[PDB]
Design a protein around this ligand. Sequence first.
Ligand code: CHL
Ligand SMILES: CC1=C[C@H](O)CC(C)(C)[C@H]1/C=C/C(C)=C/C=C/C(C)=C/C=C\C=C(C)\C=C/C=C(C)\C=C\C1=C(C)C[C@H](O)CC1(C)C
Lengths: 234, 222, 81, 41, 207, 216
Amino acid sequence: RALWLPGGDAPAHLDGSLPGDFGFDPLGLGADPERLAWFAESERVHARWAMLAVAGIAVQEVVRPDVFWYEAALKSPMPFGNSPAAILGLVAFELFAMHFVEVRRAYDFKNPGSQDQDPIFSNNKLPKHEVGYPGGIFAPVIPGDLAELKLKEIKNGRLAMLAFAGFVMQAQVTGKGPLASLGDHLSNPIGTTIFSKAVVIPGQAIVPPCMIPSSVEYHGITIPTPCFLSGLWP
Amino acid sequence: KAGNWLPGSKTPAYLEDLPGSYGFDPLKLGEDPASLKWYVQSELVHSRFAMAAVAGILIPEVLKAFGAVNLPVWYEAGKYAQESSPIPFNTLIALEIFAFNFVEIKRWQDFKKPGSQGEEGSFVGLEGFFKGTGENGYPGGVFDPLGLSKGPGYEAMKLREIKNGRLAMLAFIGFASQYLATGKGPIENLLDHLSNPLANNFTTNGTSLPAQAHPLLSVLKP
Amino acid sequence: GETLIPTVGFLYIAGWIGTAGRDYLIASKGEAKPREKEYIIDVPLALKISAQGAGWPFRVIRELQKGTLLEKDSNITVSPR
Amino acid sequence: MKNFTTYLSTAPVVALIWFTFTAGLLIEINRFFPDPLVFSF
Amino acid sequence: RASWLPGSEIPSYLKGELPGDFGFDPLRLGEDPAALKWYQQAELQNGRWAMLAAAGILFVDLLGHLGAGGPAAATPWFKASDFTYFAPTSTLFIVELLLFAWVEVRRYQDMVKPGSTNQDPIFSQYSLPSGNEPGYPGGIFDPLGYSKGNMAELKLKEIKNARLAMLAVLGFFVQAKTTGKTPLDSLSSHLADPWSNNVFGIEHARL
Amino acid sequence: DRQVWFPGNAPAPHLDGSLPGDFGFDPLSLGSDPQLLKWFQQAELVHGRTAMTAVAGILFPAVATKAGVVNIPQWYDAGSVWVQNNPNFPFAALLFIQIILTGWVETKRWLDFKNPGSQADGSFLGVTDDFKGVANGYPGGKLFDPFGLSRGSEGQLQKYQENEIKNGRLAMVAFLGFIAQHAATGKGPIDNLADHLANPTAVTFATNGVSLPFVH
Ligand code: CHL
Ligand SMILES: CC1=C[C@H](O)CC(C)(C)[C@H]1/C=C/C(C)=C/C=C/C(C)=C/C=C\C=C(C)\C=C/C=C(C)\C=C\C1=C(C)C[C@H](O)CC1(C)C
């Protein structure tokens, strides 16, 4: 099968049944089978959340170039309530909704087929499916076969996870959005890479400062905004 | 057995069927069966005395904290009661000595011979009050007027009495030591701990950790 | 605090030491080589018995009431009178 | 190691360890609490 | 089988025998059958008194708001003890304690021995119907023919409304302690701006 | 046989190579008793894991301090700095909290050593399988090994055991070096490394001042 390192050997606990199985497990994290199933569900949900986040960051940077996505919570709209404390109501609503939907997903994982019935309307029922791939009303149209689409989903999700890590780290080291950093790299390719402004030799070390402030004052809360392991930066 | 006080330890075999037993006897005080019976009775008597005492301290203190009543605090309640007492101090002591001599001799005689205080001629006609339940430390009769020892939950109430008793004993010793170390009431100590639990505890009362025994207290300070 | 409380403290510690020694001797009496434990100390057993000497007055008073604290006069050697 | 610990369990070695502990405890008590004559605090 | 958490394990002692059995016992509080029977009786008693309390608190609250009541309904439910009546506070507690002593001793005598207290003590011809549950009496307590027509369904409605009323009365008690407001004032403040006037924000402003 | 600490010398006869990191090193024969050997194996594992955590928590803050990003105090001064910067948290209260928490976890570990699998009875909040213990000094389970790196394969477990014991011994030697370098230079370990990297021919133990007390 396609291996992350061609010519190498896949570990024995990765047979190739899972979508996107390229034999990449050098640490042996998935050698326990129930841990492998749990980590497959975790990879799927991480991939989908990172896909949505990367698409949202790109769109809301294209739509609003004057708003930093790192600082987008400070300038977020407030369509509900006339008070600055209306964020706690939105937090409560989000916590209730995500608790419901994630408990539904988790109990589908532990008990397969248990959460297939609509709790309100007993006629509505999801058809029988696999764990982590609900289908039914969640997938009204499937443009193609399931296995190739699953491979496409996991590949795009891994790319989006790497892209979100890049978005975060570039926001810390540049203080600016993704496509602006891409334009700065396109303007000066030789002098904008991480290898350009960061050099560590045994003599001395040059570490770029992070432009994000260490804290912000959000209605008298003083939210800490630490640069992610900035002392270990090159 | 209700459980194990030290999970993984080998609990003594003579504490297997006792109510409120967690196998806790590292000093082997109850290894002798007669000692075990005597200490079961002693733990029950201590438990019930501490139970009533902690009630009579805490419930007036909680009602005072809520503002319902204004009663003197427990460490000074002897002073204000004796000034308004029609019976002075010495005769109160003598009456308590007489009454407790009588009732504790009756309890002791029942411990030595179970059911003996309920036989004919044990009292002057009123021995039916104290027929006994045939159990060490559980008298019954007048002492169980509602008759809930005959109910199904008798064994659960025995476990509830013993555990609340141990909690009450620790609570009264806590009240005494907290007064002797801080000089204030128990609810005052609780509110001081709730206001600043890092700085208001036994490590800062100046008594529980003596300065001579702990020289690092005065050194490792701001 | 000059004599009476020191008297109580000393009597408690002395009864502790005596009861620990008695318990160690009685435990070593039941072994196959009782004299061996008297000069090669069973240190874990001695530490366990030594910690159990805190509750000496209860066990000692019970043994006094039970009659097991004292050996009978018929079992103790005496010289001809 | 068993034979060495058996030698440490002999009566003079146990006596040395125990009396070192007791003498040290008395010395450090009299150092931390100098001149104790009465049970008064 | 209906349950509080679908797809989760149900305790073995809850098999739908009890009315309103949704398998909800995470603490395993009722394990012995006698304790479970006592807790069933306690749930029924607390729920019925909570239904009465919820009705009595909601009726005064709209009467005071709309003015349809008198000056008595104008006072809050937690300040209703400061109102002056024909009798002082000491005597009313005593007479209600005596009447409750009689009623609840009759009920407890039924609980210990079913069918023991089923006859009128002064009228030998007036007796409750046989086969009476400890928590479900008959006769004069059901003057209308309501125990035909799915007795099982009506027990479920009773226990559902009882649980809702218990939660509502606890909400009354807690909202009076924190906000210091009548229940309708709290409902109007939540309906004023719900995203800032709820348990969050208010308790963060309290601090 | 296997590789030994002194090539040409036979390994200690009570060390048969079953334990991780067995190089036959016991010149004082302290591990002759198998029960005492299990006790000393738990001692070495606890010491090594504590040393590994401590050396990481000394080195990474000191590396970050050397780069100028933060001003975390050196390891020999952090208790003083914390006490001076936390007047509302007394030293005795912090020590009491540490002592009761460590006493709880270490008494559980001790009682598992005395009787293996005895903490698996569900007495602590219903925890049954996670407190059973895989081997002596290797608890495992879903709590202590949540990624399941010990439940996958046997050879992977032995490789990770060798990694753990060798890094633990290295960290213990490193902490000894931390103590000796602070006592000789009065500076942090990353400060010592930076001074050595700046000019290694003159920044040596022979030039600190206390390793060679003479003038020279
Ligand atoms: C549980 C018993 C008990 C305890 C702990 C206290 C404790 C206290 N009383 Mg109090 N009292 C007690 C019982 C009684 N007192 C009083 C009458 C007073 C007065 C009038 C005053 C106090 C005050 C005080 C406080 C002053 C300190 C003190 O006097 O130490 C006493 C400590 C003791 C331990 C007392 C001894 C109690 C004893 C052990 C009870 C049992 C003895 C039996 C003979 C049992 C013997 C063994 C049996 C098996 C044969 C202190 C909080 C006063 C204070 O606030 O002013 C500074 C105050 O003015 N008490 C009476 C009335 C007879 C009691 C009845 O038992
Ligand atoms: C050996 C051992 C064994 C095991 O082990 C256990 C043990 C415990 C340890 C031990 C045992 C023992 C024996 C039994 C003892 C007993 C005895 C005798 C008979 C007594 C008498 C007889 C006794 C009597 C006469 C006595 C005494 C009396 C007198 C007056 C006193 C006085 C006083 C006191 C109070 C104290 C103070 O301070 C002072 C004075 C003033 C001085």
